[PDB]
Subunit: 189 residues, 6 copies
C-alpha cells in the first residue's frame, strides 16, 4: 500500500515521518522530491590494487566540496558518492523506496544504482551513488532536486527495526556521503 | 498492495486503467509486458561541451528511425532514448512501477535506468533509457517486448494527481522518445 | 502491502514461502538478505559479431567456478551472471522484489540491474546480473551476502501463476546462472 | 638520415617537396608543424552490426563541419577522422613520418593512430585519426597545429613509388577526411 | 638512412635480411607489408587482481584459434595479442620499425602498443598488440595484411646484437603470440 | 642514419649527448633504456567542464608521489603524466625518438601518447603520457625501465635548435611531469 500526497503530509505534520528541512512544495502526487547536498566522495586512491568487500579500506575515497556557487563536474563513466540535504526518520511501520527523477535519467545521470530499500526505523541522511552514462560531463548543482522518495505501508510494525541491535545495522544516524562498511560482520564460504 | 493478473484485467476492461493498444496475451501473473516503439533519440551532438540540467539544451539529441524490417543497433556503452508502443492512462488511485525483463537483462540490455515511478494520473507514452553493458552490440527489433509494468494501490486517491497544475508536471501527454525537460522550474543554491 | 520480519518468518515456517537453505539471522526488518553462489557465466565468446535477442546464441557464455577459497574477480566495466545460494518458492498470492545492498552499492558493485520482479508461483534459484562501475576490480567471495528480497501482498491470488502454461514462462525451476532464453516465443 | 630545418627549406623552395599552403614559421628544428582542417568524419551509423575490413562499408561515417568560429568537440573515448589543411607531395627519394605534438599529447589528445609512414611519391592531404583519452571533452579549433612531419632520406630512389600501378595504392590524391578503402585488393 | 624497395629486395635475395615465407608482391615503395597469423592471446583470467610487471603471471592469457575460415572478433575496447605469419631475421647492421596500415587505422584498429623498434640481430615472429577503438567489433581474418615494416641503416654494426648475452634479451626466437617476460631481470628503486 | 650502441657510447663519453645519471648497462643494440621517475600528475579536477588547448588550465592536474617503496597504481582507462629519471641534453646535429618497451606493451601499458620526436638542442627531463588498456590495474614501480630512446643523425646541424628564440620552444629545461603549455602562442 503506497502513500499518496494527502497521507504523506499527514505523516509529516503528525511527526511520525521526519523530514528535515521539510518543504511543502516538494510533495508530489505519490512521493516527495529530495535534494542534493554539497559534499561528495571521489575514488581517487592510487595505493590499492583492488576492492575487497571483506576488508575495510580506509583511504579509498576523498571528501570533496565544490567552491560555493560552483558545480561539481561528473565525468562520463565516473562514479561518486553524494548525500541528501534532508534527514529522514522513518517510523517502524513504514518502508521507503528511493528512485531517480525522469528529467535527469533522460540526461544520462544514474542517481542511485541497484539499491532500493530504506528500512523501517532508519534515521539519517541518504547516501547517493551518482553515475554518468552520457558522453559529456554533467554539472551537478548543490541543492538541486536529485531523486524522490515514496512510502510503503508494512503489514505490521517491524519487530526489530533498523538500528536495533538484533538487526546489526551499519549506518544508523549517518551524516555525509558515508563510505561502505561491508567489512563489518562480513560472512562467506 | 500489488494488483494481480485478475485485478489488472478488471481495471483495463472497466476503462479506469488505459492501455492502447491493449493485447490480452501480454498480461503476466503480476504485471503486463510492454513493447518497444520504432523511434529513438541518439546523443550525437558535437557543439556542446557539457550537460547542464539547469539549461535547456535543444540539439542534444537526434531523432532516428530504423528502416522498416531492420533493427536499431545499440553499441556497447552507448545510451539512447526509446518509447513504448502503448499509451498509458493511470487513474488517481493507482501507481505504476516499470521494470526490465529478465530475458534481456541476461543479455546485457538495461531498460529502466535509475528511475522507477509512474505517477497517479499520468497519461502518455513512456520514455525508455536504453543502455548496453555487454561487449557486443545488441540489435533491438521494434515491436519486441522490452519491459513490464505493475500497479500498486495507493492508501487513498491522489489529492493533486500528475498533470494537475499544483504538481507542476513536465511530461503530461508525451508522445515519442521525449528529451529531458529538467530546466523547467529548476531549483539550486 | 509489504511483509515485515514478523510476517516473513510466519510465511517461511508455515511452509508457504520456501527458502532453502534458510537461515534465521538473515531476516532483516523488512526483507531477507541473500547469498552469492559459486558459479558464474562470463561473456568471452569470440565468434559472434552481435547479440540478437531473437536468436538463441548458445556459446555466448562460459561457466566459471572459482578455485575453492579463492575469489571471483570482477573487472571494471565487466558484466557477469551469478546465482543465489538459496532456492526460492513463492506462493501464488505473494510477489517478490530483489534489490542490492547499500554496502556493496557504495563500492561500485551493481547486483541486479533494471529488473525487480519475481513472479508469484516462481520456483528456482535467482540469476544475478553483476556489474562493476568503480575503477578497481572487485573480489567477490562465494557465500557472501549479495542482495536482499522483500515480499509484497497481491490484491488477490494469481489466476495463472508463474510456470503455468498460460503464462508461457521460460525459467521455472532454474538452477545455475541461466543464460537468456528470449528467443523462445519472440515477437516483433 | 633525417632532414634538418636547413635542408627542409631547401627541398621546399627547390620545388621537390610540396607543401601547400606553405608557411615558413611552421618549420621547426627537425620537422614541420601541420594544421587541422575543418572537415571531420564521425562514426554514427546505426545499421551495421560490425566492421569487416574485407567489405566496403559506405555509410559507416558522416561528414561534419563546425559552424564557422566554433570548435569541434571530441568526447572522451570518441574516435573521429580529420584532415590536414596542407597538401603534401613527396618526391621518390624521401619518406615522411607523421607524429603528434607533445603539447597536445599532454592534454590526452591522440592525434594519429598507430601509423606513421608517408610513402615516397605520395601526393594529397593527410587523414588523421583523432582520439581523446582524457576524462573531459576537448575542443579542436580548425587551423590549429595538430601534428608535425619530418623527412627521411632513402638509400636510393623508390623503384615503384606510391601511386604507381605496381604498388596498388588506394589513396593517391586524397582530399578530405577519407574513409578506409581496405576492401580494395583484400587478401586472407 | 631508410631502405627503399630496390634495396630491400637486394637484402632479401642476398640472404642477409630473412623473411619467411617471403612474397615479392608485398614489397611497398619504402617498406614491406606483413600478415596476421592465426593464433591469439586473450586476457580472460579471473584469479588475478592486478598486473605487476615485476612478477611472472602465468595464467594471465589464454591461447585461442579461430575455427578455420572463421574470423577472430575483436570487441570495442578489448586488447589481444597476435603474431605475424612471417619470421624475421635481421642482420647486425639494420634496424626495423613496425607500423600499422592506414586502411586499418581508419577503421579503428590499433595494431600495436606504442612499441616501434625491432633490434639488430633479432630473429623470430613478431608479437602484435591488437586493439579496437571504434564502437563496433572488428572481424580479423587470419592471413590478412596487418601492418608494415621498414628498415633503417645503422651508423655501424651493433657491437652486442639482440640475442647476445650482453644484451640480456628476452624474446630471441619467439614463436606464437608470446606473453610478456618483464619479470626477467626486473629493476626498480 | 641511426646510431648503434658503439656510436651511442661514443657520443656520451665525448660529452656531446648528455644523459644524467648515465648507466652503461642500459645501452641496448640500437637504443638506450630509460627509467621512470617518482612524480606523477593526475587529472582529478572537478571544476572544469572541458579542455580547451587555447586556454591555460592551471588546476587541471595534481602532483602525486607514491609513498617510498610503494607503487603507483594506474587504473584501467586512466591517463597520467610521468617523468624520466634521466635528464637528456641533445646536440644540434642529433634527433631522438622515444618508444615504449615491448615487455610493457604486452601487459597493456601505453607509455607515451602519439608523439615521438625529441628535438635537436633539447635539454631536460622527458614527460611521459602513461595509459592503461588492460582490464586490470597496473602497478608502476619508480626507477623501473619504462621506455627507450634512439638517436638519428641529421643531414646537417639545426640552424635554429630547440630552445633558441626563433623556434619559440615551450619546454626547454623542464623538470617534473610538466603540464601542457599549448596556450602559449596558440594559432587558429
Ligand atoms: C528480477 C529477476 C527475476 N528472476 C526470475 C524470477 C522471475 O519470475 C523470472 C522471470 O522474470 P521475467 O522478468 O518475467 O523474465 P521474462 O519476462 O523475460 O521471461 P518469462 O517468459 O519467464 O516471464 O526470473 C531472475 O532470475 N533474476 C532476476 O534478476
Ligand atoms: C520511470 C519513468 C517514468 N516516466 C514518466 C512517468 C512519470 O509519471 C513521468 C514523470 O516522472 P518523474 O520521475 O516525476 O520526472 P520528474 O520528477 O523529473 O518530472 P515531473 O516534474 O514531471 O514530475 O515520466 C517515463 O517517461 N519514463 C520512465 O522511465
Ligand atoms: C537505498 C539506499 C539506502 N540507504 C540507507 C537506508 C537503509 O535502511 C540503509 C541500509 O541499507 P541496506 O541495503 O540494508 O545496506 P546493508 O544491508 O548492506 O547494511 P545494513 O547492515 O545496515 O542493513 O542505508 C542509503 O544510504 N543509500 C541508498 O541508496
Ligand atoms: C616525444 C616527447 C617529447 N618531449 C619533449 C622533447 C621535445 O623536444 C619537446 C617538445 O616536443 P614538441 O612535439 O615540439 O611539442 P610542441 O611542438 O607542442 O611544443 P614546442 O613549442 O616546444 O615545440 O618535448 C616530451 O617531454 N615528452 C615526449 O613524450
Ligand atoms: C600515416 C598516415 C599516412 N597517410 C597517407 C600516406 C600514405 O602513403 C598513405 C597510405 O598509407 P599506408 O600505410 O600504406 O596505407 P595502406 O597500405 O593500408 O594502403 P595503400 O594500399 O595505399 O598502401 O596514407 C594518411 O593519410 N594518414 C596517416 O595517418
Ligand atoms: C615493436 C615490437 C618488437 N618486437 C620484438 C622485436 C624486438 O627486438 C624485441 C624486443 O623488443 P624490446 O622493445 O627491446 O622489448 P624489451 O626491452 O622489453 O625486452 P628485451 O629485454 O628483449 O629487449 O621484440 C615484438 O615482438 N613486437 C613488437 O611490437
Ligand atoms: Mg516528479
Ligand atoms: Mg515475464
Ligand atoms: Mg540489510
Ligand atoms: Mg614542436
Ligand atoms: Mg601500404
Ligand atoms: Mg630492450
Ligand atoms: Mg609513435
Amino acid at each position: 500500500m503506497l502513500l499518496s500526497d494527502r497521507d504523506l503530509r499527514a505523516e509529516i505534520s503528525s511527526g511520525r515521518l521526519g523530514i528535515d528541512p521539510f518543504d511543502d512544495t516538494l510533495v508530489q502526487p505519490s512521493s516527495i522530491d529530495v535534494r542534493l547536498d554539497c559534499l561528495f566522495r571521489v575514488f581517487n586512491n592510487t595505493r590499492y590494487t583492488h576492492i575487497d568487500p571483506a576488508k575495510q579500506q580506509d583511504e579509498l575515497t576523498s571528501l570533496v566540496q565544490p567552491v560555493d556557487g560552483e558545480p561539481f563536474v561528473l565525468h562520463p563513466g565516473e562514479f561518486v558518492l553524494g548525500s541528501t540535504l534532508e534527514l529522514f526518520t522513518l517510523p517502524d511501520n513504514l518502508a521507503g523506496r528511493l528512485e531517480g527523477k525522469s528529467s535527469l535519467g533522460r540526461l544520462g545521470l544514474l542517481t542511485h544504482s541497484t539499491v532500493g530499500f530504506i528500512d523501517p526505523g532508519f534515521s539519517g541522511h541518504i547516501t547517493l551513488e551518482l553515475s554518468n552514462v552520457a558522453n559529456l560531463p554533467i554539472t551537478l548543482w548543490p541543492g538541486m532536486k536529485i531523486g524522490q522518495l515514496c512510502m510503503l505501508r508494512l503489514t505490521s510494525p517491524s519487530e526489530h527495526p533498523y538500528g536495533s541491535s538484533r538487526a546489526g545495522s551499519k549506518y544508523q544516524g549517518q551524516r555525509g556521503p558515508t563510505p561502505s562498511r561491508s567489512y563489518q560482520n562480513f560472512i562467506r564460504s
